[PDB]
Amino acid sequence: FLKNNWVLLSTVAAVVLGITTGVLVREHSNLSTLEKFYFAFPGEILMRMLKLIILPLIISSMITGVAALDSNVSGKIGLRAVVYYFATTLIAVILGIVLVVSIKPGVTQKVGEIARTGSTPEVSTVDAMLDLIRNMFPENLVQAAFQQYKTKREEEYKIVGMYSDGINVLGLIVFALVFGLVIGKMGEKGQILVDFFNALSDATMKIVQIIMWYMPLGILFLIAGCIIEVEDWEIFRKLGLYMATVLTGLAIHSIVILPLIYFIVVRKNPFRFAMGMAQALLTALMISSSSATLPVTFRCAEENNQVDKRITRFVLPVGATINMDGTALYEAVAAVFIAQLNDLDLGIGQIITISITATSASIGAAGVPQAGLVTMVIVLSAVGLPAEDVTLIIAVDCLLDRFRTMVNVLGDAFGTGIVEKLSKKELEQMDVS
């Protein structure tokens, strides 16, 4: 078993050791504010090392996957993937609404005891929905590689725009898809570009494999530092039911709904599918970033369970940005909890409004600095509640974001096989032409 499953064993041992180190240092020592940063420094180095790979990997993988197919086949596969993602997001939103309504956590608790932290960002709903489309088509490609576009109202108000930092994944993916479609059709004129991007993708995969060797040491200090940062257990005890209901929703989704759909579509063991991606699930748990974890998910999905290259190369980059299942669940649950905190009546129209708003805003908050706060503000504004109440959950927002990424990765892994089976006729038909 050793020397072949070394990476997974090292990751598990690092997780256990980091938990032990963090709890011991917190319980039997006291550190200053500055020293915790120097204790978590290796985690930051690992996080920037993983952040750097994202751009070339995403671009080359998307271009290769799109150019490896034909126009009609690419259209059909993209349509199937989009339909599957939308259906699973809508089902997740319904599940979250039903669970949070049935549990009724906010009624028993009192608003006065809970303390507020952080601030409420200024959000305009229509402006955000238009910013999505504006970012879909950036003005500059080089600027789109590390910057995003934002618009705010100012003055009977006029619109003024500005550029802020942050890689624009959506616009890059759209342009890569168009470029891959074009050079797939060019043929003998675009073969050199296809070869260039294939080589770039392979080199990026090798660099990722190199980074995976150092990953466990970073993970140890990442976990230890994250555990150290907690101030007291009173905030967790007061908000225990909120974590209970979000985690119950995520677990129910992951264990029931996705394997059930997999069984209605295909016929195999969904749990054999799920157990082969433990490395990717852990990667998601500690790194907690769907884009950063993409190389690991790619590698595990390609190697462990033998999936075809075209389906993986085309489904994984799209599912990185579009698939938002845990996010929507958390938005719905937290928003309804906030509504319960205040005096409100749960009408059917209001529930339908929340159901639509959670999905729409979660799709809107696909890639942004703080998706959760913006989505919560949009949902509250649609309902009519004040936007200041987003501050309460911030103290316990970080914990769930670790499991949301794991759920998203599992959903992408299941959807890859689902689409593969669905379009298995085309793969065989076009193999010789």
Curated annotation (Swiss-Prot):
It is a multi-pass membrane protein. It is found in: Cell membrane; Apical cell membrane; Synapse, Synaptosome; Early endosome membrane. InterPro entries: DAACS, Na-dicarboxylate_symporter, Na-dicarboxylate_symporter_CS, Na:dicarbo_symporter_sf. SUPFAM superfamilies: Proton glutamate symport protein. Na(+) 2 binds at residues 321, 362-363, 365. Residues 26-48, 102-162, 224-243, 338-350, 385-397 are extracellular. GO terms for molecular function: chloride transmembrane transporter activity; cysteine transmembrane transporter activity; D-aspartate transmembrane transporter activity; glutamate:sodium symporter activity; high-affinity L-glutamate transmembrane transporter activity; identical protein binding; L-aspartate transmembrane transporter activity; L-glutamate transmembrane transporter activity. Residues 271-301, 351-384 dip into the membrane without crossing it. Glycans are attached at residue 30. This is Excitatory amino acid transporter 3. One of its GO terms (biological process) is postsynaptic modulation of chemical synaptic transmission. Glycosylated. GO terms for cellular component: apical dendrite; apical plasma membrane; asymmetric synapse; axon; axon terminus; cell periphery; cell surface; dendrite. It comes from the Eukaryota. Na(+) 1 binds at residues 85, 88-89, 319, 323, 325, 408, 412. It is linked to Dicarboxylic aminoaciduria: An autosomal recessive disorder characterized by abnormal excretion of urinary glutamate and aspartate, resulting from the incomplete reabsorption of anionic amino acids from the glomerular filtrate in the kidney. It can be associated with intellectual disability. Schizophrenia 18: A complex, multifactorial psychotic disorder or group of disorders characterized by disturbances in the form and content of thought (e.g. delusions, hallucinations), in mood (e.g. inappropriate affect), in sense of self and relationship to the external world (e.g. loss of ego boundaries, withdrawal), and in behavior (e.g bizarre or apparently purposeless behavior). Although it affects emotions, it is distinguished from mood disorders in which such disturbances are primary.
